[PDB]
């Protein structure tokens, strides 16, 4: 139940999820040989946590993982169906839409979309 679609890139906007849903995959990129590819948000009946840790060289949901030694750009997540992110306007001023609610994953008759 993973969203095979990337969130829409809106001009003058930054998209971030507050809480990541159980099943989310964050790839670990910067290099990091030994092992450790991505991090899985998963846990038992009572808890939620990110499974692995990532090195580098050259409530029902998980909380955003703390930045590691080398990580570029906005993180390339792999979200799950039903995950919701929020857009924020930084220095670009437009707020004709009062109540902010967009970007959710839905299974539209077989294919995932934002």
């Amino acid at each position, epitope marked *: 139940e993973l969203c*095979d679609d990337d969130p829409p890139e809106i001009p003058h906007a930054t998209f971030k999820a507050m809480a990541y849903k159980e*099943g989310t995959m964050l790839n670990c*990129e910067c290099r990091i040989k030994s092992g450790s590819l991505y991090m899985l948000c998963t846990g*038992n009946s009572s808890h939620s946590s990110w*499974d692995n840790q990532c090195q580098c060289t050259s409530p029902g949901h998980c909380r955003e993982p703390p930045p590691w030694e080398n990580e570029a750009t906005e993180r390339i997540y*792999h979200f799950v169906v039903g995950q919701m992110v929020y857009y924020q306007c930084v220095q670009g001023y437009r707020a004709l839409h009062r109540g902010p609610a967009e970007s959710v994953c839905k299974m539209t008759h077989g294919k995932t979309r934002w």
Partner: antibody
Framework: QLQQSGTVLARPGASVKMSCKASGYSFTRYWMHWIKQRPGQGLEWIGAIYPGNSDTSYNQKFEGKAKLTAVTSASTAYMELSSLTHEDSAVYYC??????????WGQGTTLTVSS | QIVSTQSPAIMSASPGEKVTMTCSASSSRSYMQWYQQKPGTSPKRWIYDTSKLASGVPARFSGSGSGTSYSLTISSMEAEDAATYYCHQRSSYTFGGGTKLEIKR
């Protein structure tokens, strides 16, 4: 979903390239794993590849034996296998990684290496 | 590098018997997965995150363990269960040696 190439034959010292054609999902967004299984014995992890940026990772046993590549435009993952010996005669599986577990596997490719 | 070891290699069970098979880590792990395989087919997901059954896995199967010691358990053995079970972990992606489960008669 996951269609691998047919049975291969090879001689000792040769190389071989097998394929694994993905279909019905975004080839770019998933890790692709390769797994060896010698006749009778168990499963061995060969390595993985992210076809989005070709970031590969290998089991230490196969560093210089296996080479993992992908062609995004074909939706096909490849594995080349060098200086083949008798101990490479096995069944090779490609599988998609669902994080929790490997959720889909190919039917496998039987490599036989002999003179 | 993390290395899995399974005991036993081969075991027999009469229909109805409780069956238990063990997998132990060389270094601490968070979760343990199990896969099932029958001759002529691919391994199939069976148990993930230590105790969580995959879709279609019978209720007879349960998963247990933590730290460096884990186990798969069948409460009541049925003919359909004869297989090899491989333990597996998502830290370094190594497999156990597998436990082959057969029918005692």
């Amino acid at each position: 979903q996951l269609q691998q190439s047919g049975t291969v034959l090879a001689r000792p010292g040769a190389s071989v390239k097998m394929s694994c054609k993905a279909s019905g999902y975004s080839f770019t967004r998933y890790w692709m794993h390769w797994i060896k299984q010698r006749p009778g014995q168990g499963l061995e992890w060969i390595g993985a590849i992210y076809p989005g940026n070709s970031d590969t990772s290998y089991n230490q046993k196969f560093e210089g034996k296996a080479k993992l590549t992908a062609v995004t435009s074909a939706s096909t993952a490849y594995m080349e296998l060098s200086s083949l010996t008798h101990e490479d005669s096995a069944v090779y599986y490609c599988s998609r990684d669902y994080g929790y577990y490997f959720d889909f596997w190919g039917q496998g490719t039987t490599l036989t290496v002999s003179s | 590098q993390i290395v899995s070891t399974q005991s036993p290699a081969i075991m027999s069970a009469s229909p109805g018997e409780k069956v238990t098979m063990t997998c132990s880590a060389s270094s601490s792990r968070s979760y343990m997965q199990w896969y099932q395989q029958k001759p002529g087919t691919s391994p199939k997901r069976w148990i993930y995150d230590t105790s969580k059954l995959a879709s279609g896995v019978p209720a007879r199967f349960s998963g247990s363990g933590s730290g460096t010691s884990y186990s798969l358990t069948i409460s009541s053995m049925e003919a359909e269960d004869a297989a090899t079970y491989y333990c597996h972990q998502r830290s370094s992606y190594t497999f156990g040696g597998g436990t082959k489960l057969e029918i005692k008669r």
